[model samples]
Target: QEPTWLTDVPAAMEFIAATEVAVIGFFQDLEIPAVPILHSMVQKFPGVSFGISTDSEVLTHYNITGNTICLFRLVDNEQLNLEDEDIESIDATKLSRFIEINSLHMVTEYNPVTVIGLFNSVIQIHLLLIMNKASPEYEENMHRYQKAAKLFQGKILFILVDSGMKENGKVISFFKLKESQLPALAIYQTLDDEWDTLPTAEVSVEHVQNFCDGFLSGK
Candidate 1:
């Protein structure tokens, strides 16, 4: 479903009237009450603006575009919870299938050891999305990798490793050949233990989305 507040004009007004926070996953718990504090902040410090999405138009009351939302306010944006990696489209059937496929394997493949290892690593991560050379979608998928890399410029990097360029398994063993499918995304985060070989990540779109949300909101 589309984000009613952001996409729907009228519903957004009703949302703003009853709501205390802006878009979900944009802020933290203690930061909620800071919404009102924004006013005082403007008084003490000039050029502060606040805004709310409403029916007719965006009410630039305080004239602010970005407002923080917490995990508690995430209910509004829950529809955006799906992963980008397993995307078939914005369609429901493909999304459901995506979730089901990843859920079954996530726990096993994404064990605590793996999570801790990735988290504790000192080196930065670089997501490597691979695709078959012959596939038509190859170039488009490569763009996604570059886009993600730009999105995560300071925190992470994204790069497309050509399928036949070299035996990737020799470079990163964890990615044992699952299948020779074209346009496959393989995520990797560097570990501080030693930069010997960056481990591959069994990432789903939801995982990437969640990481982005968490980093932005600190939620």
Candidate 2:
């Protein structure tokens, strides 16, 4: 029999797990004035909706809220990582365009020079602009602040949270996702007491074959 929404949370969790749920992200970075590249990246992803602040807006229009799963590039969280001074140093105009270019390449394999140049160029312009206008003390602070964003690149982390936990304390991500548990899937083939492969739900023979061979072996 086909599953129904009436099933409890456990059933939903099992079904989603069995179906192999993969976490992904949607970002409001699409709004910044200087970002067309990011705008297109959001469009490329399968499902995304624009956001609005008010309740009447959500009721009338649409919004993304609750325990929604989101994916983010590690480098983008400059403020969270205490790189705010660096971020603030950015010329609003140059920063806007920089974001646009970075966003554009989010999904595509654009050249690293194109991406890094945009980023580093903005920092250079920002630093020079600050020096020309502001005090040497200010520039020194900005220098420390801005270096963090550059240090972060090519790494991504995926996090998932259930829909109900928004009102609770810090957003407790519901699931801590990790790479496959199977020994052959990992680069280290040897055994370890702490490492055991996670089990999968029932599936067709062909599905099993593809997962182990195509996914496992490919890993």
Candidate 3:
């Protein structure tokens, strides 16, 4: 998978702006061992747009030196850097783990079999908040969820779901979490596909860990 070798500043920005998640390899030297690894990554992670930039001006403008891999997410306007010590002993495995851990943010997303170790890790559970798109409460609800997500960062993966999306209905009703309300909250336990429901209006943590065994599977 040859990447979108962006050669200029504006052109790179345009490529970066075109997708939900953009990963650029700001490699000053293209012949490094890391270069082939990046190209292979472009094939593995679907939906994550891959880009390359060798232009000195573009790399310098982005404050990049040597070989660097940066990932940008549009949802939170955040970027993740993987280089230096972390990149020193680089391979497909470590690099994959790097993407796995960092790809999961305060609020991870709900995508089909994607989003790094989200679906891969059997140890991690998910906290998904569902709500309509156009509303003032959406942000406030997310803020509360974000706070909760931070405390459970290592234990739980917080996710935001938009009720406005028609295709999301499959997940909306994780076997009956009706889209009948405004802001519904639920947690999916990884051990089993069992999902638990909590208060619809607030963002709070249900008694987890010690509590288990009620869930419903979904598409």
Candidate 4:
């Protein structure tokens, strides 16, 4: 589908306010050169919303000084901005990768059984990272997970859960977690409904890579 144009401040605000995640392109001119790129992305991720704007008011609000593109994750009443990490470029492939990496996510207050069932249908092992949001290593672990998700792509799926949340009791018990082990890792292959936990002595990029690589190699 073609992107909806944001012609004014009110229109742009309304567009962003919608519940669907959006990828908006800010151009200085009325005609957007990246329309083709945005159109391709919209088709690629039909679940996401797309729009373009040259409205000065909207650009100023986002502090977009020059032509730029950004992805807004509007899920769970949260506004997560995934901007162009490479400020010098605005390639569509980069934007696509950004969406993939950012979409690797965490589930909160969700039905654990249903979530697992959904992932199980995909024919890929679910890499579940059970961690407390308050842990000092939480951010680092997320970074590693995103990297692994990008590398493994369609071969594996990643999901994160906050151990501190009471609603996640089912998942915690399913994995047999302990209070002392607030942050942990588990790999669940749905074909046989098997579960394996990784060593949590430390969680780092290299450690995540090893776990994924070993699993992929049937170690």
Model 2 lDDT per residue over 6-34, tens place: 12334333333332111221223324322
Q: Return the TM-score for each candidate structure.
A: 0.32, 0.20, 0.54, 0.50
Candidate with more favorable, higher lDDT: 2 or 3: 3
Clashes of each: 14, 10, 3, 0
For residue 72, give model 4's deviation from the true position in Å: 15
| Candidate 2 lDDT for residue 129 | 10
lDDT to native, each model? 0.35, 0.25, 0.68, 0.65
Mark the regions of model 3 whose C-alpha exceeds 4 Å error after superposition.
104-107, 110-127, 130-183, 186-219
Candidate 3's TM-score: 0.54
lDDT of 3: 0.68
Best by TM-score: 3
Error of 2 at 209 (Å): 13
Off by over 4 Å in 2: 1-82, 97-101, 104-106, 113-218
Rank all candidate structures by their TM-score, best first, as comma-separated numbers: 3, 4, 1, 2
lDDT of 1 by residue, 1-219 (tens): 122333244544455444322232121222343334322332332211223233223323222234332111111221122223322133434423322222211011232233332233232554445544566765554444444544454454444445555554443335554434434544444542222122233234454445544544531
102-169: candidate 4 lDDT, tens digit per residue: 44232212244436333533435677778888888888877776666666645656677777788887
Worst 10 residues of 3 by lDDT: 210-219
Tell me the tens digit of each residue's lDDT in model 3 across 27-136: 87777767788888877878678889889988987788788888765544556778887666678877665655546455766655344446554335776677877777
Please state the error at residue 114 of candidate 4 in Å.
7.8
Q: 148 in model 1: Cα distance from truth in Å?
A: 2.3
- Single out the weakest 10-residue window by summed lDDT for candidate 1: 70-79
